[PDB]
Amino acid sequence: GSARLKGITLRIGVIESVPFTIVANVITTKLTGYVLDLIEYLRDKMGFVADVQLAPPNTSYTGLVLALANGDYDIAIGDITVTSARREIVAFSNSISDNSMRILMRKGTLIDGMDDLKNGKIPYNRIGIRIGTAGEDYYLREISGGSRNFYPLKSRQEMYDSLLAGIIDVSFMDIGTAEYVTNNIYCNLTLVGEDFDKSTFGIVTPKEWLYAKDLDVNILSLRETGILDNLKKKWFQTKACP
Amino acid sequence: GSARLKGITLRIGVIESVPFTIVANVNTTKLTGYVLDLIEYLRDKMGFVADVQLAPPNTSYTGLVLALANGDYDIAIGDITVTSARREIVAFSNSISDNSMRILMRKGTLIDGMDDLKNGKIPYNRIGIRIGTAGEDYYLREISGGSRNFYPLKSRQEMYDSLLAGIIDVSFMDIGTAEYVTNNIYCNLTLVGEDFDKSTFGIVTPKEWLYAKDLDVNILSLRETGILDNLKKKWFQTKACP
Numbered sequence: 001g002s003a004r005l006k007g008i009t010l011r012i013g014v015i016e017s018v019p020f021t022i023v024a025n026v027i028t029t030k031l032t033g034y035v036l037d038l039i040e041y042l043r044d045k046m047g048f049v050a051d052v053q054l055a056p057p058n059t060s061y062t063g064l065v066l067a068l069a070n071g072d073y074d075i076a077i078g079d080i081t082v083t084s085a086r087r088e089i090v091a092f093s094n095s096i097s098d099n100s101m102r103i104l105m106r107k108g109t110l111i112d113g114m115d116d117l118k119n120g121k122i123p124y125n126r127i128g129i130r131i132g133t134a135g136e137d138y139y140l141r142e143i144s145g146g147s148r149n150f151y152p153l154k155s156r157q158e159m160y161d162s163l164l165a166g167i168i169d170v171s172f173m174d175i176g177t178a179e180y181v182t183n184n185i186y187c188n189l190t191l192v193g194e195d196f197d198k199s200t201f202g203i204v205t206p207k208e209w210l211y212a213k214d215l216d217v218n219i220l221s222l223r224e225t226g227i228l229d230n231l232k233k234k235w236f237q238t239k240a241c242p
Numbered sequence: 243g244s245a246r247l248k249g250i251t252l253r254i255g256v257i258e259s260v261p262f263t264i265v266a267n268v269n270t271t272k273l274t275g276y277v278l279d280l281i282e283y284l285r286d287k288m289g290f291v292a293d294v295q296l297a298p299p300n301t302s303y304t305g306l307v308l309a310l311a312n313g314d315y316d317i318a319i320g321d322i323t324v325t326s327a328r329r330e331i332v333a334f335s336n337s338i339s340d341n342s343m344r345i346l347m348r349k350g351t352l353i354d355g356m357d358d359l360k361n362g363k364i365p366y367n368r369i370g371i372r373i374g375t376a377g378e379d380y381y382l383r384e385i386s387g388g389s390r391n392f393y394p395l396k397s398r399q400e401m402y403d404s405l406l407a408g409i410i411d412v413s414f415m416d417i418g419t420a421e422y423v424t425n426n427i428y429c430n431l432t433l434v435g436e437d438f439d440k441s442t443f444g445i446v447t448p449k450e451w452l453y454a455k456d457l458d459v460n461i462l463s464l465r466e467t468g469i470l471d472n473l474k475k476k477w478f479q480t481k482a483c484p
């Protein structure tokens with residue numbers, strides 16, 4: 001059957017990613033961003049108690065999904081890509097956003113786009129890929145014919161640091177955060193080529209979840225009334241870099 | 243619980259909409275299009291037995307959803323918009339396509355965008371709306387404050403004929419089919435303004451369906467491997483108009 005979430009306490013997994021989920025050390029931690037605002041909209045509308053739980057550091061996106069599937073959270077909200085492999089083990093709400101990926105590199109690097117990766121212009125071990133991301137599965141399917149021959153990265157920070165230090169030549173990033181970081185944080189990083197892997201972000205829930213309909217109806221309502229677009233503008237329509 | 247669809251007969255509701263589901267006579271009816279190709283892809287991967295059932299000629303999109311909810315079909319596949327109100331009574335698969343709407347008009351008409359409809363540049367009886375479509379709920383929320391004061395249309399054909407005959411000045415149409423019709427069939431109709439009501443198309447299923455996971459995993463696999471993009475290119479890239 002089904003039921004409403006009013007009165008229910010949800011352990012909500014979130015995962016650090018600026019400006020979706022922003023973690024500030026203050027003197028304890030304070031969370032802000034698109035995700036926290038979305039949670040407030042849902043909490044206010046649906047009446048659950050939000051127990052927001054930040055995933056341990058270097059928890060991967062796949063790791064978060066697996067932790068939820070094992071019972072560690074009730075839902076997980078973030079820049080979490082809906083994939084076939086994940087859908088085998090968890091359900092997803094209606095999509096909160098479209099998504100695609102872009103190629104991230106250091107400015108001045110002689111790469112014109114994806115054909116340069118697919119034609120072997122870049123040594124495979126100088127392509128950095130964040131393990132436990134949807135981008136890893138894309139790489140393995142479309143670039144390397146299944147071979148794990150990329151330079152593995154444990155976090156976005158390692159991705160940025162390795163690019164800037166010249167340890168890797170390129171990586172992949174979701175478009176929203178890719179634009180955000182290159183337009184606001186690392187002015188010397190840039191995006192190149194057409195976007196790829198058109199996909200979506202969804203809220204992760206247990207399979208056959210009692211509260212599936214309540215959540216979906218609410219997400220769709222926020223879509224239809226322009227709230228999701230408002231939140232995207234609020235958090236993403238900014239550019240500090242000259 | 244859950245089950246796989248292999249060997250199981252699915253009654254699949256489809257609805258006329260070129261080039262998603264294209265209906266030809268000779269007496270017998272022949273069906274072709276993106277939808278029919280998609281059914282074949284899913285059938286081959288999942289192993290179900292497809293019992294494809296064209297909805298009666300005058301069936302509306304809301305009517306199709308309600309027919310499914312009533313048990314008249316097992317799933318429905320088409321250019322069917324995922325909306326909050328529909329999600330109250332049926333579930334939807336992971337999206338098969340993004341969607342948005344555009345303003346449809348005769349070439350030459352002096353309309354800049356949605357502002358003209360909101361500012362009252364157009365008499366309400368000269369705005370045609372196809373009843374029982376998602377666009378009707380958009381009109382009611384954004385334009386008329388709940389009043390059904392539009393020129394009601396019973397079909398796309400009535401929409402085109404009424405625009406060409408000058409009985410109405412504008413209507414709304416989903417972008418995929420709007421581009422197709424104005425680029426191939428009605429060369430003297432055109433689209434104007436920014437797209438609006440960003441949404442998705444999904445396969446309609448019963449709520450709490452036994453087979454939800456099997457279907458979603460397979461749809462996401464078709465997305466990831468590029469089949470959905472191939473199908474879109476195949477059916478929508480054409481442009482016959484000079």
Ligand SMILES: N[C@@H](CC(=O)O)C(=O)O
Nearest residue numbers: 061079080081133134174
């Ligand atoms: N959206 C990706 C994470 C990332 O690329 O940052 C995922 O869910 O795996």
Ligand SMILES: N[C@@H](CC(=O)O)C(=O)O
Nearest residue numbers: 303321322323375376416
């Ligand atoms: N996609 C619309 C139908 C249409 O606009 O042709 C719906 O599901 O209501």
Ligand SMILES: [Cl-]
Nearest residue numbers: 094095337442
């Ligand atoms: Cl959706």
Ligand SMILES: [Cl-]
Nearest residue numbers: 091207208455
């Ligand atoms: Cl499920």
Ligand SMILES: [Cl-]
Nearest residue numbers: 095200336337
């Ligand atoms: Cl989706």
Ligand SMILES: [Cl-]
Nearest residue numbers: 213333449450
């Ligand atoms: Cl449901």
